[PDB]
Design a protein around this ligand. Structure first.
Ligand SMILES: COc1ccc(CCCc2noc([C@@H]3CCCCN3S(=O)(=O)C3CCCCC3)n2)cc1OC
Length: 107
């Protein structure tokens, strides 16, 4: 599934609810540290809404455990990521993913 390890704590009180928009910054890496994507590189947070199949499952469950202000490492098994297909040219088949995620805001 998904493991969450805190890099810097959030407020411990403001957690994402079903149907809220999560605003984050992330960097995604393969297990060997190779970077496959980063919102920080584009100077523009990523947004998604819980409960709408908008993100891979490990994000849905992992970001849901975070509170506003938290920065965490999410380690996601391929069943909870891109599985056998991967993402063409970017994420290989059967890849465990590591994300550095910061939950900036709920809208
Ligand atoms: C619940 O499962 C599914 C539900 C929905 C889909 C559609 C795609 C949703 C999605 N798009 O991006 C992503 C992830 C996580 C959010 C940040 C962006 N990334 S990312 O890992 O960095 C990715 C890497 C390849 C290049 C594009 C960015 N999730 C797929 C699902 O499973 C395969």
């Amino acid at each position: 599934g998904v493991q969450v390890e805190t890099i810097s704590p959030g407020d411990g009180r403001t957690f994402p609810k079903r149907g809220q928009t999560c605003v984050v910054h992330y960097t995604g890496m393969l297990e060997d540290g190779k970077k496959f994507d980063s919102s920080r590189d584009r100077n523009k947070p990523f947004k998604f809404m819980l409960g709408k199949q908008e993100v891979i499952r490990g994000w849905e469950e992992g970001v849901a455990q975070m509170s506003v202000g938290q920065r965490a490492k999410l380690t996601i098994s391929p069943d909870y990521a891109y599985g056998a297909t991967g993402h063409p040219g970017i994420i290989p088949p059967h890849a465990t993913l590591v994300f550095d995620v910061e939950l900036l805001k709920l809208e």
